[PDB]
């Protein structure tokens, strides 16, 4: 019927936007991480620790949105 026409667009928009956000944010962060490392090797591990701290806050809302995208595409669609 007409439901299945919309549901997958209503999912794909969510997931494409989450992808844009996650990738752009993680790259903006990872660039500052890397060029910082290249200054001072043997500061690499501490910076990587802190990078993994900060990455966990970036992937929060995008991953909520991906979870709901998968909900719609399979709990509904």
Partner 1 sequence: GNLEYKHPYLEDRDVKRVGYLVVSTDRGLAGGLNINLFKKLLAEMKTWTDKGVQADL
List active site positions. Answer: 59
Smaller CB separation from partner 1, 28 or 34: 34
Q: Give the largest CA-CA distance in the chain.
A: 61
x/- mask, partner 1, residues 39-58, rule CB under 8 A, reads: xx-xx---------------
Residue 26 CA to residue 59 CA, distance in Å, equals 8
Kindly identify the residues of this chain, within the stretch 14-43, that bind partner 1 according to CB under 8 A.
39-40, 42-43
**Residues touching partner 1, count (CB under 8 A):** 4
The b-or-e profile of 15-27 (16+ CB within 10 A means b, else e) is: beebeeebeebbe
């Amino acid at each position: 019927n007409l439901n299945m026409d919309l549901l997958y667009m209503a999912a794909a928009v969510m997931m494409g936007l989450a992808a844009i956000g996650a990738a752009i944010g993680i790259g903006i962060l990872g660039g500052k991480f890397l060029e910082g490392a290249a200054r001072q090797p043997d500061l690499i591990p501490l910076l990587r620790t802190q990078f993994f701290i900060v990455m966990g806050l970036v992937d929060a809302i995008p991953m909520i949105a991906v979870g709901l995208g998968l909900y719609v595409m399979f709990a509904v669609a």
